[PDB]
Each structure stands twice: as C-alpha cells, then as structure tokens.
C-alpha cells in the first residue's frame, strides 16, 4: 500500500462547540516515543499549555501500545484551523494531519 507508520491509530477530525471540550489521541506501537503537537507548521502546542490546552501521555502494558492524548477545553473560535501530530521513535519519524472546527 504505502509504508505503515508509527501510528496504530491516527488522530481524527472533529467538531467542537463554544464552551465545550474535545479530545484527540494517537496510538504508537512499541525507549518511549516522543510526541509533538503542532498548530500550523510552526506553532508548538506544548508551549501553549494552560487552562485551554492539556497534554496527557499514558502507557498500557497489555497491548504494548502508547496512547498520546491532546486535550482541548473551553474551545474558543480562535482555535479553528489545521493541527499536525508528530511522533518520533528510535528508528522512525512520522506525522499526521487533522482539522479542528469550532462552530458559533
């Protein structure tokens, strides 16, 4: 098909209302992989973490799969746009593209 990347599960597109909360996640197959969340090409979400954005990382022993989560709360209209998820491993680099839309 095409090479199969580091994501068992790719981030998914979603819609969020004003004042609501939306969660996006990425799964990586089994040193632990490092994930960067980007708004546009040059905006790093990790430096944008405050009341509006949270980052959560978890590891599950049973499946040997790492789950990375992006948490958005009180999603303002200003958050509408294109978001890019990048994950790096010992031997591989990979990225995924998804869009967040805020209505109202």
């Amino acid at each position: 098909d095409d090479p199969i990347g580091l994501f068992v599960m790719r981030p998914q597109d979603g819609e969020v209302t004003v004042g609501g909360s939306i969660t996006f996640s990425a799964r990586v197959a089994g040193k632990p992989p490092v994930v960067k969340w980007f708004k546009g090409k040059w905006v790093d979400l990790s430096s944008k973490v405050g009341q509006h954005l949270q980052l959560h990382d978890s590891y599950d022993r049973a499946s040997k799969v790492y789950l990375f989560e992006l948490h958005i709360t009180d999603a303002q209209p200003a958050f509408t746009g294109s978001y890019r998820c990048e994950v790096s491993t010992k031997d591989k680099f990979d990225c995924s593209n998804f869009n967040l839309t805020v209505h109202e």
Binding site: W42, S47, G50, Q51, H52
Partner: protein
C-alpha cells in the same frame, strides 16, 4: 509614536514613548471571586484586573501573574495586557510599536513566550525587549556606572562601562519587596496582630511603603527601642482597627541588608554590589564605586541611600570617596528609560519586526538582542 510597558512584579507601568510619566500605573494583580454570590443582575465578571481588584478586594482572591521575575500563568498576563491597552491607553497595538522590560538572568522561555504572545495575541507591527538595569541608566542620563535594581519581583545588579556589558559581573539576588511583605506579616504576629489572608496581605504592603524605613544603624535603633516614644506610629485600617508598630518597622527593610533574618545564605544587597565590582576589571572599578544608581519599587524607603553609603565605604577601600546617586522618582526610572530609548532615531531600526518574526520564529529574540 511608540508604547512602553514596564512589567515588574506587583505593578504595571504603561504609557506613550516620548512622555515624562506613564499614562497609567496600577498593581499587577488578577482576582477572582472565591465566594458564590446570590443575586440577580450581577455582571458575574469571572475576573477583575488591576486596581479594580483593589476596591472589591474582600470578596476576591488575589493572584500575582509574576513571581520572582517569572510569569507563573500566561493567560492572566494576557488579561492584564488587554486591560493596559484597551482600558486605560485606549489604543490599538497595530497602530503603535511596543517595548517590554526584562529582568537580568531571566529564563529563556519567558522572553520567547512574551514575544509570541505580543505578535499573535495582539497584532503589533514591531516590538522589543530590553533589560531593566539599562533603561534606568538612560533615565539617569549616565552611560557609565553600576545599577542596583530592586523591585517587588527580584533584586538585580548590572554594572555598565561606556556601552559595554559584563555578563559575568551581573549578579541576581533573590530579595524583593514581596519577600519583605511575607517577613513583615510574620513579624506582626509576635505583636498580637495576625494577617493570614491575601486581601489584607496587601494592606501591610501599603504600610510598608510609607511607614517602613531603613535604620542608619540596626543595633542602635533597636537599642533605643526600650524607650519607644518616636518609634511608635498609629496606622488606620479600612476596617477601622488601629495598629501601632515600634522597632518592628525598621527591621523589615533590614532583611535586605540581613538575609539571615529571612533564613537564606545569600549575602545582603550591599555585599552583592561588591561581588559585581570585584568580578569587574581593576581599570573601571574607581568610577563604579562613585556611580552607584538605585532603581525600583522597594528602593523608595528612606535611609536606603544613607545606609548603603556607609556600608559600601566601610567594606571598600578608603582610598576613593564613595558616591551613591538615588534621585527622586527612581521607581519610575525604568519606564522613563524605556520611553527615551523608543524616542531615539537609531533605536527604531533595532525593533523586532512582525515580518522578521513570522519566518524565523520566537527564537530570534535571544539572537537579535541582549
């Protein structure tokens, strides 16, 4: 024209470049109502910014966005900046360039994020970040000397010789007016008065600003405290309660001189100045001793210049006379320096353009400036 904003802890100073005094000065506090209100027709106003908080202080809980020269929460800062421009200045950032002030030995993240918020949160054609010690020096009108900069946030020392910088010689000291306030509230309890709330915490700060002073000699005033006649003064609270303080008032300012009372190893403000000078080269040491400049919010208390003068002279060689210049309105000197800096023709090319930021990114701040 241009806009200059001085963001030290506890206060926000803002105004237009080319002006002697800032348009608006207010405390840097963000407050939220901790208690539920049971009424109909209330604004609700999730938070209050600036002096608005001071009036409605009892209901609210007060949070300081900047601690020890470090911004703890960025969104609160954004509300403050929003408040400074639209609420008082009544101007658009797009129309005017904006100058911000930075404390010495400050972390990299604070400068990079601050520029990122100004370029994207507010749309500004250009902006610049400068060090607090150098702006005070321009307000003074002197290009050579040593600047002692202390405020609510953190005490900083930065010697200046003919336009050259000496990074090794620059010393950061973790002493501040806010730190003094914690010492002060603690000292009141021994006398039978206790404050455990943030709202009255500022009340002692108000007390400290005018009632507190610096003793010429700590041992001698404390010694004469036995016959407390002139050492006791009555202070009136908004409550209506009356507070009287004696030897307690002068010793709080003493703590800057004596960090031991606070419990920290680091040397006092006068010793730190010596450390910066010792680090510096022998050729430029003689002018620095007589060129001492005092700036910041907590340098206001009377007797600071006089106590520093004897202490610096005592530790230093008697070979050269020691002169300290601490002019009135020293608190506003940093903002004033910013206003003059913006005014100069050469400086405008120097501003970090919006255009430069978009390609290269937030990391250019360290690359372009000091």
């Amino acid at each position: 024209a241009a806009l200059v904003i001085d963001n030290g802890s506890g206060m926000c100073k803002a105004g237009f470049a080319g002006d002697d005094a800032p348009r608006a000065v207010f405390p840097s506090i963000v407050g939220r109502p901790r208690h539920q209100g049971v009424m109909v027709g209330m604004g609700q106003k999730d938070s209050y910014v600036g002096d608005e908080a001071q009036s409605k202080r009892g209901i609210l809980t007060l949070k300081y966005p900047i601690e020890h020269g470090i911004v703890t929460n960025w969104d609160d800062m954004e509300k403050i900046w929003h408040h400074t421009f639209y609420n008082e200045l009544r101007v658009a950032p797009e129309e005017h360039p904006v100058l911000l002030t930075e404390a010495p030995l400050n972390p990299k993240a604070n400068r990079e994020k601050m520029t990122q918020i100004m370029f994207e949160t507010f749309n500004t054609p250009a902006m610049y970040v400068a060090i607090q010690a150098v702006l005070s020096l321009y307000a003074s009108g002197r290009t050579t000397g040593i600047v002692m900069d202390s405020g609510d946030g953190v005490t900083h020392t930065v010697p200046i010789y003919e336009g050259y910088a000496l990074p090794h010689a620059i010393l950061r000291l973790d002493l501040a007016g806010r730190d003094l306030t914690d010492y002060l509230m603690k000292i009141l309890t021994e006398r039978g008065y206790s404050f455990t709330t943030t709202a009255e915490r500022e009340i002692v700060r108000d007390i400290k600003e005018k009632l507190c002073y610096v003793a010429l000699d700590f041992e001698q005033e404390m010694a004469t405290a036995a016959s407390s006649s002139s050492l006791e003064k009555s202070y009136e609270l908004p409550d209506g309660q009356v507070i009287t303080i004696g030897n307690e008032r002068f010793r709080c300012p003493e703590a800057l001189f004596q960090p031991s009372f606070l419990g920290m190893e680091s040397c006092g403000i006068h010793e730190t100045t010596f450390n910066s000078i010792m680090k510096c080269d022998v050729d430029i040491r003689k002018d620095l001793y007589a060129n001492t400049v005092l700036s910041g919010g907590t340098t206001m208390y009377p007797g600071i210049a006089d106590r520093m003068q004897k202490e610096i002279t005592a530790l230093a060689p008697s070979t050269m006379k020691i002169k300290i210049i601490a002019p009135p309105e020293r608190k506003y000197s940093v903002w004033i320096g910013g206003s003059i800096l913006a005014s100069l023709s050469t400086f405008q090319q120097m501003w970090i353009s919006k255009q430069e930021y978009d390609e290269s990114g937030p990391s250019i701040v360290h690359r372009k400036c000091f």
